[PDB]
Symmetry: C3
Subunit: 140 residues, 3 copies
C-alpha cells in the first residue's frame, strides 16, 4: 500500500507510527499544554498535515485509556479528515468527567488516526424505494 505523504509542521512532534502490525490507528499528539475543566472543550493542533489519496478518509478516534480513566473524548468524533484537506490536523477535545479537570502537556498523545476507504457515491432521486424486512424500524 502506497505510504501517505506527511508534512511535519512542528519539529517537536514525532512522525506517527503504527505500534503493532495490525493496529487500526496511529497516535496523534497535542502541540500545546491545555487544562480542560469539567464539561469544557478545546481545539488543539497536532503538528501534522497529510495528503490522503482520493477514495480514502482519515478518522480521528478518542484514545481508549484516557476516555475510561479521565473522561477525555472528541466532540465531533469520529473526526472526519477529507482526502483533499491540506491543513494542519486539529482535534476538538472535551472533558466528560463531572469533577476532575484534565491537564495535557505538549507532546501528550490525545487521539488516534485511522485511514479507511470511503464510497464516493452520488444520490439519485427516485419516486419509490424497494421494500425490505427491516423496513422503517429505527430509533434515530
Amino acid at each position: 500500500i502506497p505510504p501517505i505523504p506527511l508534512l511535519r509542521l512542528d519539529p517537536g512532534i514525532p512522525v506517527p507510527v503504527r505500534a503493532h502490525e495490525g493496529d487500526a490507528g496511529v497516535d496523534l499528539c497535542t502541540t500545546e499544554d491545555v487544562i480542560i475543566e469539567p464539561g469544557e472543550r478545546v481545539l488543539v493542533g497536532t503538528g501534522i498535515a497529510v495528503a490522503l489519496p482520493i477514495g480514502t478518509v482519515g478518522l480521528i478516534h478518542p484514545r481508549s485509556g484516557l476516555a475510561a480513566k479521565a473522561g477525555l473524548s472528541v466532540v465531533n468524533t469520529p473526526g472526519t479528515v477529507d482526502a483533499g484537506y491540506r491543513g494542519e490536523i486539529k482535534v476538538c477535545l472535551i472533558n466528560h468527567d463531572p469533577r476532575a479537570a484534565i491537564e495535557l502537556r505538549r507532546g501528550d498523545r490525545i487521539a488516534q488516526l485511522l485511514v479507511q476507504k470511503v464510497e464516493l457515491v452520488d444520490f439519485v432521486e427516485v419516486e419509490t424505494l424497494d421494500e425490505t424486512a427491516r423496513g422503517a424500524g429505527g430509533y434515530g
Copy 2:
C-alpha cells in the same frame, strides 16, 4: 459506482451533494427548528430516505464547525444506518456546551453522511484463540 436511490420525503430539503470530489460525507439538514439547551438532546428528521446496497453502511458524523464552535454533537455517533433501512433518516443531536443554548432552523446543516463497506461476517465459537504480541492489553 452505482448511485444510491434517494427518496425526498420533504420538498423543502435539498438533495444532498458532495462538496468536493474526494470529500467523505454529504450534508444532512434538520427538517425543523429546534432550540437545544445546554446538556439537552433532541431527535430531528432529515427529510430523506435511502436504499443503501447490501454490503454497505451509512454513517452519521457530527459537523466539525458546529462541534468546535457551539459544542453540537450526535449522541449515538457515529449514527449507524443499516442497508435494509427504508425509513426517514433521523439525527439525535446533543448540546455539549455548558452554558449557551444552540438554535437550529429548518434547513440548517446538522450532520454529515458517509457511505462505507462493512464486513457482513459470522462469529464462530472456538475453545481457544491464537496468540499475538498485543495480547490482552487494553483500556476498554
Copy 3:
C-alpha cells in the same frame, strides 16, 4: 467471508448474531448490573473475546434506541478493537442525560460491534504536499 473466531468468556452471555442480512453490527451485552447516574461513566465487560483478521478493525458504536431514549452513549466512541487484541471486549458507557439515571441489568444489550477493513499504511515525511481545491479550509 471467513467467520471470526469468538471465545465465550461468560456462559451467561449469548453468541452475538446479525439480526438482518445486511445489518452493519451485532449486539454486545453487559456482563454486570450497573446504575449510571447522570454525567457518570462506567467500564463494563461484554463476555467475549475475538480474533479479528489482520487488515480489519472492530468498531463499538452506541445503540440508537438507548441513545435517544435515555442519553446512553460510549465515551471513546467509536470504540476501536485492534486485530491483534485477544482480551475481553469492554465498553466504556456514559449517561448524557442531565437528570435520569440509567439502570442496566446483566444481559442487557449496550452497544453494537461492526467489522470493517482498515488501511494499514505508513506515513512518509515529505517537504511539501500537493495542492487541492479544498485547501486548508477546516474547523477541526
